[PDB]
Amino acid sequence: TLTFRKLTARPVLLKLQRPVTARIATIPDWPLILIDIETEEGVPGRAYLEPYVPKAMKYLVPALHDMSDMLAGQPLAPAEIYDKTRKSLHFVGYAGLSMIAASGVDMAVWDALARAANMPLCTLLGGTPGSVKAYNSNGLWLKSPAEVAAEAVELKAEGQGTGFKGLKLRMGRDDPAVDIETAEAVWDAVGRDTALMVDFNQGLDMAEAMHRTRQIDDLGLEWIEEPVVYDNFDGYAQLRHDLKTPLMIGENFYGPREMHQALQAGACDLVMPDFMRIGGVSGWMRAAGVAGAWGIPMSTHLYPEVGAHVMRVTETAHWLEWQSWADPILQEPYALSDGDLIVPDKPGLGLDWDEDVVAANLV
Amino acid sequence: TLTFRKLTARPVLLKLQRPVTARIATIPDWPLILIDIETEEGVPGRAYLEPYVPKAMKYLVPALHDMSDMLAGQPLAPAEIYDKTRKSLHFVGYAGLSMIAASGVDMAVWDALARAANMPLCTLLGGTPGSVKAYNSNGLWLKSPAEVAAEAVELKAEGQGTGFKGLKLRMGRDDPAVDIETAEAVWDAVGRDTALMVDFNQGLDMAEAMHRTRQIDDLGLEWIEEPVVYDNFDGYAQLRHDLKTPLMIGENFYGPREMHQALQAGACDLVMPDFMRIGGVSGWMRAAGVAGAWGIPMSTHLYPEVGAHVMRVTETAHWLEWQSWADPILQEPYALSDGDLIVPDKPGLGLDWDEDVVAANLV
Amino acid sequence: TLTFRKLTARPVLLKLQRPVTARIATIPDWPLILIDIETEEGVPGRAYLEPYVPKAMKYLVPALHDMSDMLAGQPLAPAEIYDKTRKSLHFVGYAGLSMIAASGVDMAVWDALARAANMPLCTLLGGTPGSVKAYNSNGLWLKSPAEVAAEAVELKAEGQGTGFKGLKLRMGRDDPAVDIETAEAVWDAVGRDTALMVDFNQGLDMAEAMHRTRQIDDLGLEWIEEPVVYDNFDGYAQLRHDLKTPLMIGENFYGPREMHQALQAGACDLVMPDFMRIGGVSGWMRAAGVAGAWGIPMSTHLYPEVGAHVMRVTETAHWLEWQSWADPILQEPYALSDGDLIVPDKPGLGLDWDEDVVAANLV
Amino acid sequence: TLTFRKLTARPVLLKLQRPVTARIATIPDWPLILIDIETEEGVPGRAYLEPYVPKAMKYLVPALHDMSDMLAGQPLAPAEIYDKTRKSLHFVGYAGLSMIAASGVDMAVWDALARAANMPLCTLLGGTPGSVKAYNSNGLWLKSPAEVAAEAVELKAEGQGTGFKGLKLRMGRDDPAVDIETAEAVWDAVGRDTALMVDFNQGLDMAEAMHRTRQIDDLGLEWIEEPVVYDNFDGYAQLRHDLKTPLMIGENFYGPREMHQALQAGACDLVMPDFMRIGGVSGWMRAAGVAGAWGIPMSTHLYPEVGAHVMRVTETAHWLEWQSWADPILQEPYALSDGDLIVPDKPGLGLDWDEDVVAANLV
Amino acid sequence: TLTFRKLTARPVLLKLQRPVTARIATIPDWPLILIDIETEEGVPGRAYLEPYVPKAMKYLVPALHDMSDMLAGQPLAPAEIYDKTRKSLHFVGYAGLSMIAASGVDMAVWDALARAANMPLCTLLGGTPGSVKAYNSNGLWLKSPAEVAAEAVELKAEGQGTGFKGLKLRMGRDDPAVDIETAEAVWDAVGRDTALMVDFNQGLDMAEAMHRTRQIDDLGLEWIEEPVVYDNFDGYAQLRHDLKTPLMIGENFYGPREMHQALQAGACDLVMPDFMRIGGVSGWMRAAGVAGAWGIPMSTHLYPEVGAHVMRVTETAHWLEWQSWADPILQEPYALSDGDLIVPDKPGLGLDWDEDVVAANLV
């Protein structure tokens, strides 16, 4: 047997190696909530959240400790717990901060059940450890073309061996021609065999989206990601239709049902759920089922360690989004080989906290 | 009157003249199940199955002999038999192996019925013997461009006289540019007036299909065949809308109803039913009713002899798929003239086994 | 071989045993065109048309003789002939009188082909002679409840043995209350386990149809047939939705494609093609593929002899519509046994003209 | 008051100045049926049918005279007579030869009604005589590119003055490249100012239609007309969507409801009802209500005189189709000026027969 | 020849025999605008408008007169006039007051055109004078049941002979249950053979409409008219779906295109255009072509005289709405016989102003 004892959630703030350079402002900081579960039987559980907004950690940590109090003494069973955490907060929404806290609990609980089985997570879910093809989203923010191009060479090599086969390139400069120029410069530096995933981060309104995505539709991008506000399914459907290049969304899906509603609306060619919004491992697995049936290629967003684990059992696995923003809190991040992330043969997610860096960065 | 006595199914394995060089592996062997029907009145029936997977014959031969036992003494009437054979295995599915056994019975009993009428099959079905425009699918597997271009010269010539007006060219190499290079080499060699039908054999996921089919959309191909796994109708609907070049599927339709559902789902521009999957002659004639109503051009897959006969009475007959992989077990294969297959003036399908090649290759 | 020599069309006009009593008038005469085909090899073909409008025989007999001149010396191949005949009249329409001529030729040609094979038509089409469940449409025209009920007793009795399991009851009286009263009086006389198929013969506009079909929706009818004008598909779709009782149409389908269109539009729950409009045996078999794919129960209209043959090989065979209106000119009408029509074991349709009744009624 | 007495239909076979050179054969002859109405009040009605196939006049004349007998003594009211002609043959189809007969009657009767009112037909319908822009469909059949280019010059000039602003060009040659060459050669000769309306005459199957219409989609055609068989609404919907050039159909619409169904199916961008199929003037004015509500531009097919009249009152009037195949039997064909056809200030249609030519070409 | 000289429009305010007794207030005044046309050739035109709102006549009279000035000297051609009037006010909307002015001109102009041809309007339109089934909308306002039942006996007798076969019963009392009692009381007094058309006059919101139309759906009403505000097509679609009783709208359609949109939206089972809103005779005729293609039973609203003329040529004519509100200003209104309005054998609408009643009620 396996019984939930308590959950501890510790907020930390990390200084990015390469700060987010958007048009609106520059963001140098990256918040993380570290989550440790204890069971009566002495099996630990470890995972983390990346909630983007440092301030919101002040709402999430309390919400996590409330969930811990609620769940104390009950079976550590991810699916049961997933149902209790959501119901507890249905009155203030299944989407949003409610889901975010519930997902954090979920990943840590799955990690604990896997350790209890003495299995890597992916093995518990019915696969095995192995490689997962990945792309580098460490940077390529809205700097100058020559700066971005030089960074692109570094980001590629971060993949080891032959390098990453893809890079995420951000767009949304005041002047569209520079975005193209930046894309053209990057390919000149790293070679055209490299896949470029472009991301607008919801920066455009529909009119801007139409003109701008059309300008880049014949560039040969791997995909065009979230050009408008994430819940505009009417707009996405129009864009998907006009665009030949694959249209990518999903990082803002709050649960499998929302994915299912996006697909019924014909809103996208590709999807990439985020682990804290989709409902953790449980939400992902259900979402993989939906994506599986529609046959839509499915990628990840953030959480490279959990992502690599579930991608090993995801029917339509497409790309794993890789970045090292969370690396400092880990004793050993997963190894890279030829741009492929390697799931290590360790129980659960195989995460161990670097407590020095944690203490040096606690809030 | 005409009465079913028994049915014999004999498994053979032929050495292909040109090995199937796919991406995963090279396949040198081609399995065939020879079917001989006996009636109480002495009228024989002869047809064959081409089930691809040699191990599968050990599931199909037993299934055929069980059908033989069940049919013994009953009237040799294809439409009644098609009903009893399907009904007997409905619990283990109408589609797949069940259908395949029922389709082999069906082709052979229609052979017997046409013999009993002393009519060629096409004539019993309401047409007459004649020629059917064909294309050559003997090869053009995944070898080098210069090697495929040379092989193409030979394949066109197998058509006799002015040769085949079309060739099937397989695509799916690791590097998409080499697929294109191969098409260009082939067209240089045999001339651009030669139609090229491109087949990916379900080897791509959706994202790969979107990119690769787009790259070849302006080449001038006759059609693009099964880019993705065959039951992904949502994906096919998408590909077909985006591609200007006709999208072709159908070889994995299990029955007319499945064809009808694919057309309702807007999955394809063209269809090419396979005789062992569609329900033999009975299935084909029904799918032809469906295709005729929609106005969808209908082509064949494998079984060039049965194909030529039914194509003579198919309202939307398009292209016949010709290969000579099964020729060795026949005393006389159908003649070719300028790329048309000639249906001979013989009762039934006019097959007589070469019992030397059979014994030389029996399993 | 088998070669078309000539075709002769003789118009005859018969006094109906039970005259058509509608609201507009009383139609007492039934026209038939008797078709005889000769081949160079001495095989005959015989079939007939029931074109409803006596004077229309002056358009069809010439049309049929014109087709005989065109076909002269060509192979007697039904599928090919069906192409040729329909093609020769395409400027004056595929639907309507053109189709009626082609249909007559088609049925007779199929009869000849089957004779050539020494097989009953149904056997040639892949089935066997046997029984086909029928219902009686000889009468139950718009008379008084008392009269209709007493006639219903005789009508059930024409079935032999336990009698017809179904009767066609015509409706469309000035006072709908009397239609209902009539239906009730019939069930009172022949018993409630007798299926009543109600036919309105296109007598109503949509508002009347909405009112009257609703009034009878709960009587327990077998079906409701053509309440409005036959090409009002928008209307039929509305009626079909509002009514729970099955809605029946199709006797005015000109070809399999038109059936396809009615089904896409959602116009009906059941279909009943007429052989002179659907395209004869060739048209029926195509439409049977379409109906089979959709799963729509398929019934016949007129031509009980051809009807019984093709229903033996029609996948979704429902009811055969039986009447004795053309019996007079046949030497041996098909036998009836417990309301089933018995397809006799004779070549083709096994029709032989009763020349005494022909001369007596020739036009 | 105005009373129908009798109707006379005279079959006539003319020789075309420029013979129809198609792919399959060459038709030099053009059948006509001159129709004459007599009224008890001494007012005549004159109109003609152009039924394409000479042999079909054998069916129509008997049908026309059968309608005379039926209408004799009844009020000469076009709408009432339209109702009564259709209903009399509904059993042998609303479409096809029956509609053709009714339309001929309908045109003569509308002509009589306009004469009785002493107004040109267009004036009776609420308009006034005037010019109607036309295009020349006299030829450009399937001849040598140079032969067609030369003819195109003569054709523009038949329009008088600055000439016809549009020409019908027939496509469908064995080699599609020569179709295009012909377009380019016709333009070289008459200037790119000239609109080209391409017509395939239903000569293609769907696969041919897809390839070929795509090849000509960037040529700058005014429209592409009936590429495939006229009732294939599913195929037309696909072509319309794939093609940017407008897709024209409708010359084979039998009645206003059929146009309505085509538009619901998304079958076309432009329509061009033919007066013998659409139901004469009654049918046209109803069709114009439909096209007017959809906003679909409506053009005509054959019958330049009736055509010019109704176009004057057609809300979405587009192009008139002009040809002079019927000219010989008219004393005074309508005047041409700078491409526009001039509706004269004569009562009715203003037709008078040249009884010399009639007698010379009677049957 | 026929030329427009001037149009005079005279406001008159009558006092209804039976005052309008709605839920909100009682309305005893009925405004009419009388319209007279002068042609250069001395042919007159007479028709009237019923704008409901007395003060509106001050917007319309200046609008009609402004139209007179612009039309001065141009040909009196309804179709052409219909286009010029509508065009001149397109900047201030095609629907609404613009249309109402244009419709008044259109009816008066068609009257003149018919007079100039010495024909009744219906004869000019292809019909003949005759009877048209009518229903009585003179009263049955929101009084008590026994009062309404009493008035009903009176209203039915106004139809002469066997009486009106239909009555319009208004609903929308504060208390629904009394609406129901009123229907029964009317039926208890005039017999259940009499059709009741129920009109709510847009008086409900959707919740009330759902509840109240449902409560009366089993009463046996001829139809249910306009329960909610007239432009709520979403709501009507729902109501029409839920209600088995036919749902009637249309009196508020501004033009044939609006009817087309309503049908496309599935908004109703029946339509009843109003002549000032639909576009007079021109708009009606076009709308009749639309309605005719759909098979929608079409009825009239107000203007019994113009209505009876067009109903004689309306393919799906259903019910004529008859009331005697405008009678006082006519010398000889149309006769009734057994509930059928009689179109008299007189040129145009046969309207002549009783000028003493006009002088007596002028504004």
Ligand SMILES: [Cl-]
């Ligand atoms: Cl789903």
Ligand SMILES: [Cl-]
């Ligand atoms: Cl279908």
Ligand SMILES: [Mg+2]
């Ligand atoms: Mg992103």
Ligand SMILES: [Mg+2]
């Ligand atoms: Mg797209």
Ligand SMILES: [Mg+2]
């Ligand atoms: Mg294939």
Ligand SMILES: [Mg+2]
């Ligand atoms: Mg496509």
Ligand SMILES: [Mg+2]
């Ligand atoms: Mg019937």
Ligand SMILES: [Mg+2]
């Ligand atoms: Mg239903």
Ligand SMILES: [Mg+2]
């Ligand atoms: Mg044409």
Ligand SMILES: [Mg+2]
């Ligand atoms: Mg288009």
Ligand SMILES: [Mg+2]
């Ligand atoms: Mg009202």
Ligand SMILES: [Mg+2]
């Ligand atoms: Mg309803």
Ligand code: NI
């Ligand atoms: Ni599109």
Ligand code: NI
């Ligand atoms: Ni429903």
